[PDB]
């Protein structure tokens, strides 16, 4: 993981405008500005602040550093969780059904009757539509 480190350094370098080696509200102005976006200074100093630790009010590289970690992490897992999601979506259409979920499970090793894949179904649906779509998955696993 010496690498993500070493990719992390160049975005952060993106916003250490002068290369100082902190980040303060005034650069993260400038970057979301070239992005098209116009965040007032009240944001700026909102974003600035969901990763300044210590609160000295800028963002150092171990604190930047430490947030891109984090956020690589839960988009990995997130995207572990849609790969599952989609194997037991047999047809793809964004609901599991419970024919589907005893289908997939077979082949997978899991035997399974229409009845108990109708109570896995029904406790994990909380729109009550009679299938499982990604954000009762997700809520459910
Ligand atoms: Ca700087
Ligand atoms: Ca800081
Ligand atoms: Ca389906
Ligand atoms: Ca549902």
Do not use: C, W
Request: charged residues 35%; negative net charge; aromatic residues 8%.
């Amino acid at each position: 993981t010496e690498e993500q480190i070493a990719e992390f350094k160049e975005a952060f370098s993106l916003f250490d405008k002068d290369g100082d080696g902190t980040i303060t509200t005034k650069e993260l102005g400038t970057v979301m500005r070239s992005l098209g976006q116009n965040p007032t200074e009240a944001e700026l100093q909102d974003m600035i602040n969901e990763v300044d630790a210590d609160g000295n009010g800028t963002i150092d590289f171990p604190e930047f550093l430490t947030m891109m970690a984090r956020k690589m992490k839960d988009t990995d897992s997130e995207e572990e969780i849609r790969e599952a999601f989609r194997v037991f979506d047999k047809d793809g259409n964004g609901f599991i059904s419970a024919a589907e979920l005893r289908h997939v499970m077979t082949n997978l090793g899991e035997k399974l009757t229409d009845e108990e894949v109708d109570e896995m179904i029904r406790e994990a649906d909380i729109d009550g539509d009679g299938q499982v779509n990604y954000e009762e998955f997700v809520t459910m696993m």
